[PDB]
């Protein structure tokens, strides 16, 4: 019996292809689940996690913070034209709002 090599390792993924396979079965999404569907999906989950975490890691650095706070995730999401499309109807605990004052309200010169 050969030593086990995790399905993530063979796909190169950090995300767990084996768990993603189970969850596609446990969730009763369909009667059957091909061997490739957990690999493709786990790669997309890992990508979208990497996208948001780079923008939030930038926002954290822009505010001199080493840790991503929920604030930095919300700023990253709302400043990105595609993450704000993907999450346009999603609410983030302690995310706050974008600093945004309507120019008509600023003091007149």
């Amino acid at each position: 019996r050969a030593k086990a090599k995790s399905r993530s390792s063979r796909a190169g993924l950090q995300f767990p292809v084996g768990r993603v396979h189970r969850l596609l079965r446990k969730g009763n999404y369909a009667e059957r689940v091909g061997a490739g569907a957990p690999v493709y999906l786990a790669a997309v989950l890992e990508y979208l996690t990497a996208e948001i975490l780079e923008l939030a890691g930038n926002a954290a650095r822009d505010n001199k913070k080493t840790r991503i706070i929920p604030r930095h995730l919300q700023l990253a999401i709302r400043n990105d034209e595609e993450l704000n499309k993907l999450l346009g109807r999603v609410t983030i605990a302690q995310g706050g709002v974008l600093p945004n004052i309507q120019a008509v309200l600023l003091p007149k010169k």
Binding site: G34, I52, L53, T66, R67, I68
Partner: protein, 93 residues
Amino acid sequence: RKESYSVYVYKVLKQVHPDTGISSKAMGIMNSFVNDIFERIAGEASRLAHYNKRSTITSREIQTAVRLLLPGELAKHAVSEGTKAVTKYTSSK
């Protein structure tokens, strides 16, 4: 025993910002995001299967879900990295 993607989110974190950390409160949002986008893709792949009277969630149905669900340049890079992973999986073993 409650299962959380936090260990995998943190491995992705060190591959985009090796210096950067995350709060458990922000991690809870990340875990909520991963679960929410898993559910949305899997739910559309489920519908894609049913619409085509197929019993199997195939990778072709994850791909079409990602093309339906994600916007613009996120969809195209997601389709790329999925197809690479599936290729490496098939080639490796």
